[PDB]
Amino acid sequence: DDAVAIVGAAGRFPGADDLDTFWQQLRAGEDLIADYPGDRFDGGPYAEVVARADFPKFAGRIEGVDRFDADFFHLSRLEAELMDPQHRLALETVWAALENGGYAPARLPENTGVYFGVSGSDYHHLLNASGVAPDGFTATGNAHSMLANRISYVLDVHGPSEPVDTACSSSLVALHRAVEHIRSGRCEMAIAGGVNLLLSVDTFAATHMAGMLSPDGRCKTFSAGADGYVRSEGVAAVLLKPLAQAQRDGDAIWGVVRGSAENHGGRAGSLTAPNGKAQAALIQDAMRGIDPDSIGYVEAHGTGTGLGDPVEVNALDSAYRALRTAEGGPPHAARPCALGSVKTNIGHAESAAGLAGVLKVLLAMRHRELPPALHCDRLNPHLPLDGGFEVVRELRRWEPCTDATGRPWPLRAGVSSFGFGGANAHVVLEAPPVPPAAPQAIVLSARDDDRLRATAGRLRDFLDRARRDGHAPDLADLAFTLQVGREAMERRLGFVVGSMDDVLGTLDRFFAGDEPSGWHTGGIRRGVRREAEQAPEVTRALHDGRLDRVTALWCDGAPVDWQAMHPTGERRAVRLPAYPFACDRYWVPA
């Protein structure tokens, strides 16, 4: 009887390795398209297999695509080297989202679903073209099913585990499928994600022949000179949970999914032609119950193809128009709804394209701002003259829509995503609800001591830029999140504070490599126990109020039941930095 909260998020896109960087770039009107391939293939001969190919040499690229923390997931160098980098970045980003939402694997319900969009097997082609004989790891390393299932394996969850391949709309359909299963009760929480990586020539060449790649490698969405798109890399995941449940548990909500629909184009004239009447039917379906005067922004699919862009925008107009009419509202809108597309910034990330859209909107919601569209100085002549939709070409404050009586809705927005095979999805998002109005144990951990210093360092840094700006987390909330929002790993750090410069000071000294002065250090090595167990000594150490002893016990491996301590109603989760995954290189073997 309620909607689905987005409670955690992560992404890597051209130029940005985290969502905070991404948003910064969108806001500045940064164009992040670069050259293809770059140093990607320079190790072997495949480098000029690329140079000989026909297509326009551009892409939005992720830096460090060959990098992966294989020890984190306990993998052979060999198992990792034959593993599609798409699976590798999926793992890391999914983990990142989990942490950002404040979820250690053991906090997840056992029926957590996993729906991850993915389209290409570029790497597997790359292996073959390099002469790499088959191994048992190759099959595992390259089946799309494994992308999803390996995640469910890593997290020990038992909800449905599916790759989604609807081409260019895969990740939006993911989000939709996850929402279905949450609304239906099959899942209590779910992970929806998408990934796309450009690791071979095959699709580049083919798309070019199709006449779909623009000669200057830009997605000039809405422009008059739109003439194709440019492929991009990207990876994203979001953690999902029923809104009501998420409010009681004090999760940090990014946004709410109010509506959501998918459909297929049917016979559209050609296999890969856009179908406006289907795109309309879709939106009306997702906007069922929602007031269209209530939508403030639409993140359009917006490939920047000369045909696709006006079709989409006319279909959108046609749909909101149909919607207004149904409820007795006047034929034309009260004011122009804003319109845009992240593809002008980062290009067309295909399987990851949908969620790039979603995250842009959620970020815009956070900062109550709409970023500029790019290459869009001269608008397209086939966009509607009727003034129903405005393209945002100018960084503006995002003011809320407002009712007839004058009531203001929460910020709302639509996102579209259309596969080149005719599979379409559309999501309607809403801004998160306003959250309503003692010594603590600080607990860190990583795999290596090196990674522990790393975690502590980045925590120090984040914590004080959040005081030089006053956005400091509440202490018990910070401690709460480090306790339950993090997997307790092999190497452990722990200590006890009463204030937060107590925190910041203790971190600065550990990083600088001092011998302990009131902090503790511990270790171990070698399923997921979601059961609540607590060591007999810890149980009565807590009885006394000797926090520090608990902390030091926890470091040499004493099981603790952290959620037992806090008022089960009170605590709220906090967005801290994610794990500093090692930058080990795993590429094609020799």
Of 14, 60, 163, 255, the residue at the interface with a second copy (CB under 8 A) is 163
The site for a second copy, by CB under 8 A, has a size of 68
Residue number with CB closer to a second copy (515 or 531): 531
The rounded distance, in Å, linking the Cα atoms of 34 and 62 is 10
| Min CB(34)–a second copy separation in Å | 23
Question: Where does 136-254 show beta strands of DSSP type E?
Answer: 161-164, 189-196, 234-242
- Residue 130 engages a second copy in binding (rule: CB under 8 A): no
Residue number with CB closer to Cl ion (82 or 488): 488
558-562 CB contacts, 8 Å cutoff, 24+ apart: 559/533, 559/534, 559/535, 560/534, 560/535, 561/532, 561/533, 561/534, 562/480, 562/483, 562/484
Query: How is residue 501 written in tokens?
Result: 């410069």
Amino acid at 300: A
CA neighbor of 263 nearest in space, from 173, 179, 357: 173
| Min CB(240)–Cl ion separation in Å | 25
| Min CB(53)–a second copy separation in Å | 8
Q: Which stretch, 159-167, 238-246, 286-294, 536-544, contacts a second copy (CB under 8 A)?
A: 159-167
Q: How many CB atoms within 10 Å of residue 63?
A: 14
- Residue 488 engages Cl ion in binding (rule: CB under 5 A): yes
The rounded distance, in Å, linking the Cα atoms of 235 and 17 is 10
Pairing relationship of beta strands 297-299 and 58-59 according to DSSP bridges: unpaired
Q: Which residue is nearest to Cl ion (CB)?
A: 488
252 binds, among Cl ion, a second copy, none (CB under 5 to 8 A by kind): none
Contacts of 153 (CB under 8 A, 6+ apart): none
223 binds, among Cl ion, a second copy, none (CB under 5 to 8 A by kind): none
- Residue 197 engages a second copy in binding (rule: CB under 8 A): no
- String of contacts with Cl ion for each residue 249-288, x by CB under 5 A: ----------------------------------------
Pairing relationship of beta strands 161-164 and 112-117 according to DSSP bridges: parallel
Query: How is residue 239 written in tokens?
Result: 């953690």
The rounded distance, in Å, linking the Cα atoms of 445 and 523 is 9
Upstream peptide bond of 37 is cis (omega within 30 degrees of 0)? yes
488 binds, among Cl ion, a second copy, none (CB under 5 to 8 A by kind): Cl ion
Q: CB of 219 within 8 A of CB of 31?
A: no
- Residue 419 engages a second copy in binding (rule: CB under 8 A): yes
- Residue 155 engages a second copy in binding (rule: CB under 8 A): yes
- Residue 555 engages Cl ion in binding (rule: CB under 5 A): no
- Residue 454 engages Cl ion in binding (rule: CB under 5 A): no
Q: Which stretch, 129-137, 241-249, 304-312, 330-338, contacts a second copy (CB under 8 A)?
A: 129-137
- Residue 568 engages a second copy in binding (rule: CB under 8 A): no
| Min CB(156)–a second copy separation in Å | 4
- Residue 278 engages a second copy in binding (rule: CB under 8 A): yes
Of 271, 307, 326, 395, the residue at the interface with a second copy (CB under 8 A) is 271
Q: Which stretch, 57-65, 272-280, 483-491, 507-515, contacts Cl ion (CB under 5 A)?
A: 483-491
Q: Which stretch, 10-18, 136-144, 296-304, 360-368, contacts a second copy (CB under 8 A)?
A: 136-144
Q: Which stretch, 83-91, 203-211, 383-391, 501-509, contacts a second copy (CB under 8 A)?
A: 203-211
CA neighbor of 14 nearest in space, from 205, 236, 213: 236
- String of contacts with a second copy for each residue 511-550, x by CB under 8 A: ----------------xx----------------------
Residue number with CB closer to Cl ion (41 or 554): 554
CA neighbor of 553 nearest in space, from 420, 443, 389, 390: 443
Query: How is residue 56 written in tokens?
Result: 């326009």
| Residue 269 dihedral angles phi and psi, to the nearest 5° | 105, -45
The rounded distance, in Å, linking the Cα atoms of 460 and 558 is 26
Q: Which stretch, 119-127, 244-252, 399-407, 548-556, contacts a second copy (CB under 8 A)?
A: 119-127
- Residue 185 engages a second copy in binding (rule: CB under 8 A): no
Using CB under 8 A as the binding rule, the residues of this chain from 479 to 518 that contact a second copy are none
Using CB under 8 A as the binding rule, the residues of this chain from 250 to 269 that contact a second copy are 262-268
Of 37, 159, 276, 485, the residue at the interface with a second copy (CB under 8 A) is 159
Q: CB of 381 within 8 A of CB of 222?
A: no
The rounded distance, in Å, linking the Cα atoms of 52 and 123 is 19
**Chain centre distance of CA 504:** 29
Amino acid at 460: R
From the number of C-beta atoms within 10 Å of its C-beta (0-12, 13-18, 19+), residue 268 rates as middle
Residue number with CB closer to a second copy (229 or 510): 229
SS3 content of the chain, % helix, strand, coil (to 5): 35, 20, 45
Query: How is residue 150 written in tokens?
Result: 């390996």
- Residue 128 engages a second copy in binding (rule: CB under 8 A): yes
The site for Cl ion, by CB under 5 A, has a size of 2
CA neighbor of 275 nearest in space, from 309, 306, 312: 312
Q: Report, in angstroms and rounded to the nearest whole number, the Rg of the chain calculated over CA atoms.
A: 24
| Min CB(447)–Cl ion separation in Å | 16
Q: Which stretch, 60-68, 275-283, 413-421, 488-496, contacts Cl ion (CB under 5 A)?
A: 488-496
Q: Which residues bind a second copy (CB under 8 A)?
A: 110-111, 114, 119, 121, 124-125, 128-129, 133-140, 143-146, 148-150, 152-153, 155-167, 170, 173, 180, 184, 201-203, 205-207, 209-210, 262-268, 271-272, 278, 281, 419, 421-423, 527-528
Q: Which residues bind Cl ion (CB under 5 A)?
A: 488, 560
